[PDB]
Structure 1
Amino acid sequence: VKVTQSSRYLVKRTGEKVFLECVQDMDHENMFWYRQDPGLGLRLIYFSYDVKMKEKGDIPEGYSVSREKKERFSLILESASTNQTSMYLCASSSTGLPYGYTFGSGTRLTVVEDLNKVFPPEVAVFEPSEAEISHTQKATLVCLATGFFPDHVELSWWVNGKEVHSGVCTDPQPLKEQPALNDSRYSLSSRLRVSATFWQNPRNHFRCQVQFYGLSENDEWTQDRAKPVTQIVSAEAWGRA
């Protein structure tokens, strides 16, 4: 009982024809493609109520769709515009069963006009101030991820190899390193806070982890630096004394 989309993130150049792919394992008759945009909720592009059937949704314009097998529902952008930049959402349902809609987890698609603009982030970890420890008996480490385009990152904290949710703030919106440019590169901060006890013990390992999603193996690359592919970039620091 799951609906998986083929890609979780994707970069594409304006004018390139794109294939988003939705798969379910439940023998469902009904599959739906939606987009989700800040301020306009979710909007239905195309839907399908059997194999080889389609019907246009509310915003079909610029999209095409194929229901070839009962399992699969392909969304096709003929020519990526930058207002096709969006989170795309697939869903399925049964005709008779009463269980409602199962949703996939989304494909973020960003369309830009040039693929040499995508940089993966560098990850610095800043270590707590002596002064906070003293005044608070807390220790806040800060992690900065700078130098990424497009905005496709997943920041995480690992304490001695277990991902921690306790005592973390990540910024919900990144800021532009150069907000004068149209397509400026981005920065994001995160924070991790623990007891000074924890931080003042040299057998505690702290790691700032940043997954980036840029390009696949398929894409044309022969520029100066390494290929800006999906990669996890970390920074680490050890607890003190």
Structure 2
Amino acid sequence: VTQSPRNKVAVTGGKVTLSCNQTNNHNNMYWYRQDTGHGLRLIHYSYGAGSTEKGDIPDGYKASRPSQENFSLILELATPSQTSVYFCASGDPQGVSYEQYFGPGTRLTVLEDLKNVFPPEVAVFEPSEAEISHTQKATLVCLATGFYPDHVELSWWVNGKEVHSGVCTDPQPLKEQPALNDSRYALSSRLRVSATFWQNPRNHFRCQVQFYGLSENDEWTQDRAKPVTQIVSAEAWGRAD
């Protein structure tokens, strides 16, 4: 089950269409939204090609099943309460099984104004000589700051290849101004390597932050750079010191 787009920023009152495609030839398709304290709740479903049915919470949404494969969710007039993670699913009623097959989810943010959208600033902080001397290990820190909405994907790249060990990223981004509504966010990550690996100047370290923002089709007439979906990186070379 696939979903498109995977991330979307929309304005209050704008029209949003979320698409779902399945290759399982299942008669049933479903649209859910996930929210804290509610698990996943059914919005609309379809018991076959050309037809749609209201789910538990249909208000503010329409659905379209133009073929056996496609099921779309339409927000004619997006409202901030529709900010959520949307999951599409398929299921086969022909057999005895009630099992459902889920898409990867679509993160939607509905904002009153697109001027609140900001990409992150990214900085890499080099290891402490005190940590190296005491532990013969070296921790680099990546800091992604000032972004909005709060979803980014941070990864570490060493000598041009993504690393999958020695890393951890904060469970959640933090609010830079907790008292403020529409506060920008910060997120950090650590990469820990051996002291001898960090000390080698042939080794290159880069922190990459994938940000999901505006699309090409969004209008932008402000002075600052358009906060489109983009990748913001910071890098450091190893050094003996």
Distance 2:225 2:52 in 1: 42
Q: Deviations along 1:149-177, whole A, 9 cap, x unmatched?
A: 11120000111122112111101111111
| Aligned residue number for residue 201 of structure 1 | 200
- Secondary structure of 1:92's counterpart equals strand
| Aligned residue number for residue 100 of structure 2 | 101
**Of residues 5, 8, 23 in structure 1, which corresponds to 2:6?**
8
- The one-letter code matched in structure 1 to 2:78 is A
Percent identity, please. 79
Distance 1:135 1:81 in 2: 54
- Secondary structure of 1:83's counterpart equals helix
| Aligned residue number for residue 132 of structure 1 | 131
* Matched positions, count: 239
| Aligned residue number for residue 171 of structure 1 | 170
Cα RMSD for the two superposed structures: 1.3
Q: Which moved more, 1:93-102 or 1:161-170?
A: 93-102
Counting only pairs closer than 5 Å after superposition, residues 175-190 of structure 1 correspond to structure 2 as 175-190=174-189
Q: Deviations along 1:99-135, whole A, 9 cap, x unmatched?
A: 9322111100011110011111111000001111011
The answer for unaligned runs of 5 or more in structure 2 is none
| Aligned residue number for residue 68 of structure 2 | 70
With structure 2 as the length reference, what TM-score do the two structures score? 0.95
Counting only pairs closer than 5 Å after superposition, residues 223-238 of structure 1 correspond to structure 2 as 223-238=222-237
| Aligned residue number for residue 143 of structure 1 | 142
Shift in Å at residue 53 of structure 1? 1.6
- The one-letter code matched in structure 1 to 2:81 is N
Q: Deviations along 1:165-209, whole A, 9 cap, x unmatched?
A: 211110111111122220011111111111111111111111100
Distance 1:58 1:216 in 2: 31
- Secondary structure of 1:210's counterpart equals strand
Q: Deviations along 1:36-90, whole A, 9 cap, x unmatched?
A: 1122111111110111221211111221101111111110112222111100000
- Asked if the contact 1:45–1:58 (Cα under 8 Å) also holds between the matched residues in 2, the reply is yes
| Aligned residue number for residue 21 of structure 1 | 19
- Secondary structure of 2:81's counterpart equals coil
Distance 2:19 2:50 in 1: 15
Distance 1:39 1:142 in 2: 33
Distance 2:93 2:162 in 1: 40
Distance 1:25 1:4 in 2: 9
Distance 1:159 1:93 in 2: 42
- The one-letter code matched in structure 2 to 1:233 is V
